[PDB]
Amino acid sequence: QGSRKRIFENTKQFIYEVNSITDPLGQSYKIIVNRWMPTDAVYFFRSADW
Amino acid sequence: QGSRKRIFENTKQFIYEVNSITDPLGQSYKIIVNRWMPTDAVYFFRSADW
């Protein structure tokens, strides 16, 4: 908790916080879930190099 | 945790919280990581006096 880099999303009508997690280095990570994952592995990427 | 002065950065679409640590004296300090460090010490500076 004490090392949780909060990150929000302003929309002019609501401030939607994001389910993000950060490492000791400060690198923030957003967490999204997909129903078609193989269920026996996790993926880390930027969604732009692909 | 209770004394950590959480500072944020607006970007017109997101609010990225910075990984800043504060001292009991009330001053805040950003935390940046670099592979170029000697790995055995840390530097406290302003980034504008150099």
Side-chain angles (χ1 to χ4, degrees):
Chain A
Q1 296 177 2
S3 185
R4 182 185 174 185
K5 294 177 67 166
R6 301 182 189 82
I7 185 177
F8 299 75
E9 180 182 346
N10 176 267
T11 68
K12 180 262 287 180
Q13 204 73 358
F14 278 90
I15 292 169
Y16 283 95
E17 182 170 7
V18 195
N19 189 358
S20 80
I21 293 170
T22 186
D23 71 331
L25 314 182
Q27 293 196 137
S28 180
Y29 291 90
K30 191 186 171 192
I31 296 89
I32 68 189
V33 175
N34 202 325
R35 300 172 183 73
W36 312 121
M37 282 282 288
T39 306
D40 56 75
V42 296
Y43 300 149
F44 311 78
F45 49 85
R46 185 156 82 267
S47 84
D49 299 331
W50 300 86
Chain B
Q1 311 182 43
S3 56
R4 203 190 78 265
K5 302 162 65 183
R6 56 182 196 173
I7 68 181
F8 310 94
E9 169 177 354
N10 291 321
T11 59
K12 177 54 200 64
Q13 313 193 150
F14 281 96
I15 296 91
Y16 304 80
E17 188 187 4
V18 190
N19 188 261
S20 43
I21 187 68
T22 177
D23 59 46
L25 279 66
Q27 297 192 346
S28 57
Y29 308 87
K30 268 79 76 174
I31 309 186
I32 314 177
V33 292
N34 290 86
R35 309 170 193 78
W36 326 119
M37 305 292 291
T39 306
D40 58 71
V42 304
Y43 298 155
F44 299 93
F45 61 108
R46 189 184 174 181
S47 157
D49 300 357
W50 300 74

